[PDB]
Amino acid sequence: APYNGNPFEGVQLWANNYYRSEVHTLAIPQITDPALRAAASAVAEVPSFQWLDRNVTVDTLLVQTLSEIREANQAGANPQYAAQIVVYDLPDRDCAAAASNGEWAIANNGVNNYKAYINRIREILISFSDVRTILVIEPDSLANMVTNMNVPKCSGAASTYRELTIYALKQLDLPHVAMYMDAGHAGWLGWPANIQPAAELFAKIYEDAGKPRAVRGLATNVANYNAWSVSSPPPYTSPNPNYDEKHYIEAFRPLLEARGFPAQFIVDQGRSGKQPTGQKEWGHWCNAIGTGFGMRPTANTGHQYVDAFVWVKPGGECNGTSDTTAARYDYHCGLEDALKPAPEAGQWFNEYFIQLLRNANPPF
Numbered sequence: 001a002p003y004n005g006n007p008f009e010g011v012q013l014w015a016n017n018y019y020r021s022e023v024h025t026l027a028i029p030q031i032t033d034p035a036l037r038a039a040a041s042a043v044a045e046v047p048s049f050q051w052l053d054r055n056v057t058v059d060t061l062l063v064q065t066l067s068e069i070r071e072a073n074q075a076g077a078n079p080q081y082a083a084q085i086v087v088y089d090l091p092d093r094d095c096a097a098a099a100s101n102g103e104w105a106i107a108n109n110g111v112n113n114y115k116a117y118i119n120r121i122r123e124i125l126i127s128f129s130d131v132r133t134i135l136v137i138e139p140d141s142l143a144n145m146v147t148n149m150n151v152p153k154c155s156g157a158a159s160t161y162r163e164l165t166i167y168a169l170k171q172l173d174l175p176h177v178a179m180y181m182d183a184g185h186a187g188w189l190g191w192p193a194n195i196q197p198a199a200e201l202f203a204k205i206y207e208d209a210g211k212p213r214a215v216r217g218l219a220t221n222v223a224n225y226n227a228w229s230v231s232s233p234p235p236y237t238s239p240n241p242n243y244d245e246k247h248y249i250e251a252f253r254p255l256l257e258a259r260g261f262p263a264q265f266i267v268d269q270g271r272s273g274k275q276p277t278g279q280k281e282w283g284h285w286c287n288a289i290g291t292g293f294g295m296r297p298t299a300n301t302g303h304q305y306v307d308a309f310v311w312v313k314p315g316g317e318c319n320g321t322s323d324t325t326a327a328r329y330d331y332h333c334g335l336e337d338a339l340k341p342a343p344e345a346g347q348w349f350n351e352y353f354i355q356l357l358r359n360a361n362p363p364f
Protein backbone atom coordinates (compact mmCIF):
# COMPACT_ATOMS: atom_id res chain seq x y z
CA ALA A 1 0.00 0.00 0.00
CA PRO A 2 1.16 3.57 -0.50
CA TYR A 3 1.95 6.03 2.24
CA ASN A 4 2.32 9.80 2.48
CA GLY A 5 4.97 11.62 4.43
CA ASN A 6 7.07 10.11 7.23
CA PRO A 7 7.08 6.29 6.82
CA PHE A 8 7.52 5.89 10.59
CA GLU A 9 4.19 7.63 11.26
CA GLY A 10 1.14 5.51 11.72
CA VAL A 11 2.92 2.16 12.14
CA GLN A 12 4.57 0.15 14.88
CA LEU A 13 8.12 -1.08 14.35
CA TRP A 14 8.61 -4.86 14.32
CA ALA A 15 11.23 -6.22 16.72
CA ASN A 16 12.62 -9.12 14.75
CA ASN A 17 13.13 -12.73 15.79
CA TYR A 18 16.79 -12.88 14.80
CA TYR A 19 17.77 -10.37 17.50
CA ARG A 20 15.19 -11.78 19.94
CA SER A 21 16.71 -15.25 19.43
CA GLU A 22 20.22 -13.88 20.03
CA VAL A 23 19.10 -12.41 23.33
CA HIS A 24 17.07 -15.42 24.49
CA THR A 25 19.30 -18.26 23.27
CA LEU A 26 22.76 -16.67 23.49
CA ALA A 27 22.69 -13.79 26.05
CA ILE A 28 20.15 -14.70 28.78
CA PRO A 29 21.58 -18.20 29.44
CA GLN A 30 24.86 -16.45 30.36
CA ILE A 31 23.19 -13.99 32.74
CA THR A 32 22.40 -15.10 36.35
CA ASP A 33 21.35 -11.79 37.89
CA PRO A 34 17.51 -11.57 37.96
CA ALA A 35 17.29 -7.85 37.20
CA LEU A 36 19.79 -8.04 34.31
CA ARG A 37 17.91 -11.04 32.87
CA ALA A 38 14.68 -9.04 32.95
CA ALA A 39 16.42 -6.03 31.36
CA ALA A 40 17.83 -8.33 28.67
CA SER A 41 14.41 -9.71 27.94
CA ALA A 42 13.09 -6.15 27.57
CA VAL A 43 15.80 -5.06 25.14
CA ALA A 44 14.96 -8.07 22.92
CA GLU A 45 11.62 -6.31 22.34
CA VAL A 46 13.19 -3.05 21.11
CA PRO A 47 12.81 -2.87 17.31
CA SER A 48 16.22 -2.59 15.64
CA PHE A 49 17.11 -2.88 11.94
CA GLN A 50 17.81 -6.24 10.35
CA TRP A 51 20.91 -6.26 8.12
CA LEU A 52 21.22 -7.91 4.71
CA ASP A 53 24.99 -7.83 5.06
CA ARG A 54 25.54 -11.14 3.23
CA ASN A 55 23.65 -12.43 0.20
CA VAL A 56 22.42 -15.53 2.03
CA THR A 57 20.22 -13.25 4.22
CA VAL A 58 17.93 -12.31 1.27
CA ASP A 59 16.15 -15.63 0.80
CA THR A 60 16.34 -16.43 4.53
CA LEU A 61 16.08 -13.53 6.96
CA LEU A 62 14.32 -11.02 4.70
CA VAL A 63 11.64 -13.49 3.66
CA GLN A 64 11.20 -14.75 7.24
CA THR A 65 10.88 -11.27 8.75
CA LEU A 66 8.42 -10.02 6.16
CA SER A 67 6.40 -13.27 6.49
CA GLU A 68 6.28 -12.90 10.29
CA ILE A 69 5.21 -9.23 10.04
CA ARG A 70 2.47 -10.13 7.54
CA GLU A 71 1.29 -12.83 10.00
CA ALA A 72 1.24 -10.34 12.92
CA ASN A 73 -0.58 -7.74 10.91
CA GLN A 74 -3.18 -10.20 9.62
CA ALA A 75 -3.59 -11.28 13.29
CA GLY A 76 -4.61 -7.74 14.17
CA ALA A 77 -1.53 -5.72 15.13
CA ASN A 78 -2.72 -2.17 15.65
CA PRO A 79 -1.23 -0.09 14.27
CA GLN A 80 0.33 -2.28 11.60
CA TYR A 81 3.99 -3.29 12.02
CA ALA A 82 6.62 -2.05 9.54
CA ALA A 83 9.98 -3.60 8.66
CA GLN A 84 13.40 -1.96 9.07
CA ILE A 85 16.12 -3.43 6.78
CA VAL A 86 19.71 -2.49 5.91
CA VAL A 87 21.01 -3.10 2.35
CA TYR A 88 24.76 -3.69 2.82
CA ASP A 89 26.58 -5.71 0.18
CA LEU A 90 28.31 -3.44 -2.34
CA PRO A 91 31.27 -5.06 -4.09
CA ASP A 92 34.62 -3.84 -2.88
CA ARG A 93 32.64 -2.92 0.27
CA ASP A 94 34.15 -0.60 2.87
CA CYS A 95 36.84 0.59 0.49
CA ALA A 96 38.82 2.60 3.06
CA ALA A 97 38.66 0.02 5.88
CA ALA A 98 41.73 -1.69 7.24
CA ALA A 99 39.88 -4.98 6.67
CA SER A 100 36.50 -5.56 5.04
CA ASN A 101 34.04 -8.35 5.67
CA GLY A 102 32.25 -7.72 2.36
CA GLU A 103 31.93 -10.96 0.37
CA TRP A 104 32.09 -9.57 -3.21
CA ALA A 105 34.86 -8.03 -5.28
CA ILE A 106 34.47 -5.87 -8.35
CA ALA A 107 37.21 -8.08 -9.95
CA ASN A 108 35.18 -11.27 -9.33
CA ASN A 109 31.82 -10.44 -10.97
CA GLY A 110 30.81 -8.13 -8.11
CA VAL A 111 28.75 -5.69 -10.17
CA ASN A 112 26.60 -8.47 -11.60
CA ASN A 113 26.34 -10.12 -8.20
CA TYR A 114 25.09 -6.88 -6.65
CA LYS A 115 22.57 -6.12 -9.37
CA ALA A 116 21.13 -9.62 -8.95
CA TYR A 117 20.97 -9.12 -5.13
CA ILE A 118 19.03 -5.85 -5.64
CA ASN A 119 16.78 -7.52 -8.22
CA ARG A 120 15.98 -10.37 -5.80
CA ILE A 121 15.31 -7.93 -2.95
CA ARG A 122 12.91 -6.07 -5.30
CA GLU A 123 11.04 -9.30 -6.08
CA ILE A 124 10.66 -10.08 -2.35
CA LEU A 125 9.57 -6.56 -1.43
CA ILE A 126 6.91 -6.69 -4.20
CA SER A 127 5.69 -10.01 -2.84
CA PHE A 128 5.38 -8.29 0.56
CA SER A 129 3.92 -5.00 -0.66
CA ASP A 130 1.48 -5.22 2.25
CA VAL A 131 4.37 -4.69 4.73
CA ARG A 132 5.61 -1.11 4.80
CA THR A 133 9.42 -1.44 4.57
CA ILE A 134 12.03 1.12 5.58
CA LEU A 135 15.53 0.70 4.18
CA VAL A 136 18.95 2.07 5.06
CA ILE A 137 21.05 1.95 1.89
CA GLU A 138 24.72 0.91 2.19
CA PRO A 139 26.49 2.11 5.34
CA ASP A 140 30.11 3.11 4.83
CA SER A 141 29.79 3.57 1.03
CA LEU A 142 29.39 6.99 -0.59
CA ALA A 143 30.72 8.81 2.47
CA ASN A 144 34.09 7.45 1.31
CA MET A 145 33.78 9.42 -1.96
CA VAL A 146 33.74 12.58 0.15
CA THR A 147 36.95 12.12 2.11
CA ASN A 148 38.74 8.93 1.04
CA MET A 149 39.34 9.26 -2.72
CA ASN A 150 43.08 9.18 -1.96
CA VAL A 151 42.64 5.52 -1.03
CA PRO A 152 43.27 3.53 -4.25
CA LYS A 153 40.48 1.03 -3.58
CA CYS A 154 38.03 3.88 -3.02
CA SER A 155 38.98 5.76 -6.16
CA GLY A 156 38.80 2.51 -8.12
CA ALA A 157 35.35 1.72 -6.65
CA ALA A 158 33.80 5.20 -6.81
CA SER A 159 32.04 4.87 -10.16
CA THR A 160 30.73 1.47 -9.10
CA TYR A 161 29.46 2.73 -5.74
CA ARG A 162 27.69 5.56 -7.53
CA GLU A 163 26.16 3.51 -10.32
CA LEU A 164 25.06 0.72 -8.04
CA THR A 165 23.57 3.15 -5.50
CA ILE A 166 21.51 4.74 -8.29
CA TYR A 167 20.53 1.20 -9.41
CA ALA A 168 19.29 0.37 -5.90
CA LEU A 169 17.44 3.68 -5.51
CA LYS A 170 15.57 3.09 -8.76
CA GLN A 171 14.92 -0.65 -8.42
CA LEU A 172 13.69 -0.32 -4.81
CA ASP A 173 11.56 2.79 -5.51
CA LEU A 174 8.28 1.07 -4.64
CA PRO A 175 5.19 2.67 -3.11
CA HIS A 176 5.41 0.68 0.15
CA VAL A 177 9.13 1.40 0.62
CA ALA A 178 11.12 4.25 2.13
CA MET A 179 14.88 4.68 1.67
CA TYR A 180 17.50 6.58 3.62
CA MET A 181 21.04 6.65 2.16
CA ASP A 182 23.85 6.37 4.69
CA ALA A 183 25.53 9.72 5.33
CA GLY A 184 28.21 8.97 7.88
CA HIS A 185 28.06 10.87 11.18
CA ALA A 186 28.93 14.22 12.70
CA GLY A 187 32.54 13.19 13.23
CA TRP A 188 33.03 12.12 9.61
CA LEU A 189 31.00 14.27 7.20
CA GLY A 190 29.96 16.90 9.75
CA TRP A 191 33.37 18.49 10.02
CA PRO A 192 33.18 21.93 8.37
CA ALA A 193 35.65 21.04 5.58
CA ASN A 194 33.55 17.97 4.58
CA ILE A 195 29.98 19.03 4.90
CA GLN A 196 29.44 21.01 1.64
CA PRO A 197 31.22 18.36 -0.52
CA ALA A 198 28.99 15.78 1.16
CA ALA A 199 25.87 17.79 0.38
CA GLU A 200 26.97 18.16 -3.26
CA LEU A 201 27.56 14.40 -3.61
CA PHE A 202 24.32 13.19 -2.04
CA ALA A 203 22.19 15.80 -3.79
CA LYS A 204 23.75 14.84 -7.15
CA ILE A 205 23.05 11.14 -6.56
CA TYR A 206 19.47 12.01 -5.64
CA GLU A 207 19.15 14.03 -8.91
CA ASP A 208 20.76 11.39 -11.04
CA ALA A 209 18.40 8.72 -9.68
CA GLY A 210 15.43 10.85 -10.74
CA LYS A 211 14.53 11.99 -7.20
CA PRO A 212 12.68 8.71 -6.51
CA ARG A 213 9.57 9.11 -4.35
CA ALA A 214 10.67 6.36 -1.97
CA VAL A 215 13.84 8.28 -0.96
CA ARG A 216 13.07 10.21 2.22
CA GLY A 217 16.62 11.30 2.95
CA LEU A 218 19.64 10.12 4.86
CA ALA A 219 20.65 7.99 7.84
CA THR A 220 23.34 9.18 10.26
CA ASN A 221 25.36 7.70 13.10
CA VAL A 222 24.82 4.14 11.80
CA ALA A 223 26.96 1.80 13.95
CA ASN A 224 28.45 4.80 15.75
CA TYR A 225 27.92 6.18 19.27
CA ASN A 226 27.28 9.90 18.87
CA ALA A 227 24.87 11.96 20.91
CA TRP A 228 21.70 13.34 19.36
CA SER A 229 21.92 16.46 21.50
CA VAL A 230 24.17 17.22 24.46
CA SER A 231 25.10 20.43 26.21
CA SER A 232 28.87 19.91 26.37
CA PRO A 233 31.08 18.71 23.44
CA PRO A 234 32.59 15.32 24.32
CA PRO A 235 36.34 15.63 24.61
CA TYR A 236 37.13 13.50 21.54
CA THR A 237 35.00 15.77 19.30
CA SER A 238 37.18 18.85 19.60
CA PRO A 239 37.44 21.11 17.67
CA ASN A 240 34.43 20.13 15.49
CA PRO A 241 31.57 22.62 16.10
CA ASN A 242 29.21 19.84 14.92
CA TYR A 243 29.83 17.69 17.96
CA ASP A 244 26.49 15.86 18.00
CA GLU A 245 24.01 14.69 15.39
CA LYS A 246 21.62 17.64 15.92
CA HIS A 247 24.38 20.10 15.08
CA TYR A 248 25.40 18.02 12.06
CA ILE A 249 21.84 17.72 10.69
CA GLU A 250 20.98 21.36 11.26
CA ALA A 251 24.10 22.37 9.34
CA PHE A 252 23.76 19.72 6.63
CA ARG A 253 20.07 19.97 5.69
CA PRO A 254 20.21 23.58 4.35
CA LEU A 255 23.17 22.64 2.13
CA LEU A 256 21.38 19.56 0.78
CA GLU A 257 18.13 21.48 0.28
CA ALA A 258 19.74 24.30 -1.73
CA ARG A 259 21.11 21.51 -3.93
CA GLY A 260 17.70 19.98 -4.56
CA PHE A 261 17.49 17.36 -1.80
CA PRO A 262 15.33 18.39 1.23
CA ALA A 263 16.47 15.27 3.07
CA GLN A 264 14.74 13.99 6.16
CA PHE A 265 16.90 12.02 8.57
CA ILE A 266 16.94 8.97 10.72
CA VAL A 267 19.55 8.87 13.49
CA ASP A 268 20.98 5.70 15.06
CA GLN A 269 20.85 5.89 18.85
CA GLY A 270 21.17 2.21 19.63
CA ARG A 271 24.58 2.66 21.32
CA SER A 272 24.26 6.36 22.21
CA GLY A 273 22.65 6.32 25.64
CA LYS A 274 25.81 7.18 27.58
CA GLN A 275 27.47 10.48 26.75
CA PRO A 276 30.32 11.05 26.60
CA THR A 277 31.38 7.55 25.62
CA GLY A 278 34.59 5.69 26.55
CA GLN A 279 36.06 6.39 23.11
CA LYS A 280 39.52 7.93 23.33
CA GLU A 281 39.18 9.25 19.77
CA TRP A 282 36.12 9.85 17.64
CA GLY A 283 37.24 7.50 14.90
CA HIS A 284 37.46 4.53 17.27
CA TRP A 285 34.36 2.70 16.05
CA CYS A 286 35.02 -0.88 17.09
CA ASN A 287 33.34 -2.34 20.18
CA ALA A 288 33.84 0.94 22.08
CA ILE A 289 33.84 0.81 25.87
CA GLY A 290 31.73 3.12 27.99
CA THR A 291 28.63 3.03 25.77
CA GLY A 292 24.97 2.25 26.51
CA PHE A 293 21.72 1.41 24.80
CA GLY A 294 20.09 4.75 23.91
CA MET A 295 16.76 6.38 23.27
CA ARG A 296 14.11 3.98 22.08
CA PRO A 297 13.04 4.01 18.40
CA THR A 298 10.28 6.51 17.74
CA ALA A 299 8.70 8.67 15.08
CA ASN A 300 8.05 11.28 17.80
CA THR A 301 11.41 12.93 17.49
CA GLY A 302 10.25 16.47 18.15
CA HIS A 303 12.61 17.74 15.43
CA GLN A 304 11.46 18.97 12.04
CA TYR A 305 14.26 17.27 10.07
CA VAL A 306 14.25 13.90 11.83
CA ASP A 307 11.68 11.30 10.78
CA ALA A 308 12.80 8.87 13.51
CA PHE A 309 15.28 7.96 16.15
CA VAL A 310 16.22 4.36 15.37
CA TRP A 311 18.43 1.46 16.43
CA VAL A 312 20.27 0.62 13.21
CA LYS A 313 23.28 -1.35 14.46
CA PRO A 314 21.91 -3.92 16.92
CA GLY A 315 23.81 -3.69 20.22
CA GLY A 316 25.50 -6.92 21.24
CA GLU A 317 26.44 -7.98 17.70
CA CYS A 318 30.22 -7.69 17.45
CA ASN A 319 31.90 -5.08 15.25
CA GLY A 320 35.04 -7.19 14.72
CA THR A 321 37.43 -9.59 16.35
CA SER A 322 40.19 -8.60 18.69
CA ASP A 323 42.27 -11.64 17.63
CA THR A 324 45.18 -10.05 15.86
CA THR A 325 45.89 -13.26 13.97
CA ALA A 326 42.49 -13.58 12.37
CA ALA A 327 42.19 -13.18 8.56
CA ARG A 328 39.91 -10.13 8.60
CA TYR A 329 41.34 -8.52 11.74
CA ASP A 330 40.82 -4.75 11.83
CA TYR A 331 43.30 -2.96 14.09
CA HIS A 332 40.50 -0.67 15.33
CA CYS A 333 39.21 -3.68 17.27
CA GLY A 334 42.55 -4.04 19.09
CA LEU A 335 42.69 -0.51 20.49
CA GLU A 336 42.69 0.26 24.20
CA ASP A 337 39.06 1.47 24.14
CA ALA A 338 37.75 -1.62 22.26
CA LEU A 339 36.26 -4.28 24.57
CA LYS A 340 38.13 -7.60 24.52
CA PRO A 341 38.16 -10.48 23.90
CA ALA A 342 35.82 -9.87 21.03
CA PRO A 343 34.62 -12.57 18.57
CA GLU A 344 34.29 -12.22 14.77
CA ALA A 345 32.19 -9.48 13.31
CA GLY A 346 28.49 -10.33 13.49
CA GLN A 347 28.85 -12.88 16.26
CA TRP A 348 27.16 -12.27 19.62
CA PHE A 349 29.43 -10.47 22.09
CA ASN A 350 27.79 -10.99 25.45
CA GLU A 351 30.15 -8.88 27.57
CA TYR A 352 29.44 -5.99 25.24
CA PHE A 353 25.69 -6.60 25.52
CA ILE A 354 26.00 -6.43 29.31
CA GLN A 355 27.99 -3.16 29.08
CA LEU A 356 25.20 -1.69 26.90
CA LEU A 357 22.56 -2.80 29.47
CA ARG A 358 24.45 -1.34 32.43
CA ASN A 359 24.87 1.99 30.68
CA ALA A 360 21.38 2.06 29.10
CA ASN A 361 19.66 5.42 29.05
CA PRO A 362 16.79 5.23 29.44
CA PRO A 363 17.49 2.24 31.66
CA PHE A 364 15.78 -1.13 31.22
Ligand SMILES: CO[C@H]1O[C@H](CO)[C@@H](S[C@@H]2O[C@H](CO)[C@@H](S[C@@H]3O[C@H](CO)[C@@H](S[C@@H]4O[C@H](CO)[C@@H](S[C@@H]5O[C@H](CO)[C@@H](O)[C@H](O)[C@H]5O)[C@H](O)[C@H]4O)[C@H](O)[C@H]3O)[C@H](O)[C@H]2O)[C@H](O)[C@H]1O
Nearest residue numbers: 094096097098100101140147188191193223282283285345
Ligand atom coordinates in the same frame (compact mmCIF):
# COMPACT_ATOMS: atom_id res chain seq x y z
C1 LIG B 1 39.78 20.52 11.46
O1 LIG B 1 39.33 19.38 10.67
C2 LIG B 1 40.35 18.69 9.93
O2 LIG B 1 41.07 18.19 11.05
C3 LIG B 1 40.36 17.15 11.76
C4 LIG B 1 41.38 16.65 12.78
O3 LIG B 1 42.36 15.83 12.12
C5 LIG B 1 39.75 16.04 10.86
S1 LIG B 1 38.80 14.94 11.95
C6 LIG B 1 39.03 13.32 11.22
O4 LIG B 1 38.06 13.13 10.19
C7 LIG B 1 38.24 11.93 9.46
C8 LIG B 1 37.23 11.98 8.33
O5 LIG B 1 37.44 13.18 7.51
C9 LIG B 1 37.98 10.74 10.36
S2 LIG B 1 38.43 9.14 9.59
C10 LIG B 1 36.83 8.36 9.26
O6 LIG B 1 36.33 7.67 10.41
C11 LIG B 1 35.04 7.03 10.25
C12 LIG B 1 34.52 6.52 11.57
O7 LIG B 1 34.41 7.59 12.48
C13 LIG B 1 35.12 5.94 9.19
S3 LIG B 1 33.50 5.21 8.89
C14 LIG B 1 33.58 3.58 9.70
O8 LIG B 1 34.33 2.71 8.84
C15 LIG B 1 34.45 1.37 9.35
C16 LIG B 1 35.48 0.61 8.49
O9 LIG B 1 36.76 1.31 8.63
C17 LIG B 1 33.09 0.72 9.40
S4 LIG B 1 33.35 -0.92 10.16
C18 LIG B 1 32.08 -1.89 9.34
O10 LIG B 1 30.88 -1.62 10.05
C19 LIG B 1 29.75 -2.44 9.65
C20 LIG B 1 28.60 -1.90 10.49
O11 LIG B 1 28.82 -2.12 11.82
C21 LIG B 1 30.12 -3.94 9.84
O12 LIG B 1 29.09 -4.81 9.44
C22 LIG B 1 31.36 -4.27 9.02
O13 LIG B 1 31.84 -5.60 9.20
C23 LIG B 1 32.51 -3.37 9.45
O14 LIG B 1 33.61 -3.66 8.57
C24 LIG B 1 32.14 1.65 10.20
O15 LIG B 1 30.82 1.17 10.10
C25 LIG B 1 32.15 3.12 9.73
O16 LIG B 1 31.44 3.90 10.65
C26 LIG B 1 35.70 6.59 7.94
O17 LIG B 1 35.86 5.56 6.94
C27 LIG B 1 37.01 7.29 8.19
O18 LIG B 1 37.38 7.89 6.93
C28 LIG B 1 38.82 10.85 11.68
O19 LIG B 1 38.42 9.94 12.74
C29 LIG B 1 38.76 12.25 12.27
O20 LIG B 1 39.66 12.32 13.39
C30 LIG B 1 38.88 16.64 9.75
O21 LIG B 1 38.45 15.62 8.83
C31 LIG B 1 39.61 17.75 8.98
O22 LIG B 1 38.69 18.48 8.21
Ligand SMILES: *[C@@H]1O[C@H](CO)[C@@H](O)[C@H](O)[C@H]1NC(C)=O
Nearest residue numbers: 055056058059113116117120
Ligand atom coordinates in the same frame (compact mmCIF):
# COMPACT_ATOMS: atom_id res chain seq x y z
C1 LIG C 1 22.75 -14.71 -3.95
O1 LIG C 1 21.61 -15.42 -3.45
C2 LIG C 1 20.72 -15.78 -4.48
C3 LIG C 1 19.47 -16.27 -3.83
O2 LIG C 1 18.86 -15.24 -3.07
C4 LIG C 1 21.38 -16.76 -5.43
O3 LIG C 1 20.45 -17.06 -6.49
C5 LIG C 1 22.64 -16.18 -5.97
O4 LIG C 1 23.33 -17.20 -6.71
C6 LIG C 1 23.54 -15.62 -4.88
N1 LIG C 1 24.63 -14.86 -5.46
C7 LIG C 1 25.90 -15.26 -5.61
C8 LIG C 1 26.84 -14.36 -6.32
O5 LIG C 1 26.26 -16.39 -5.19
Ligand SMILES: [Mg+2]
Nearest residue numbers: 012013015045
Ligand atom coordinates in the same frame (compact mmCIF):
# COMPACT_ATOMS: atom_id res chain seq x y z
MG1 LIG D 1 6.79 -3.26 20.09
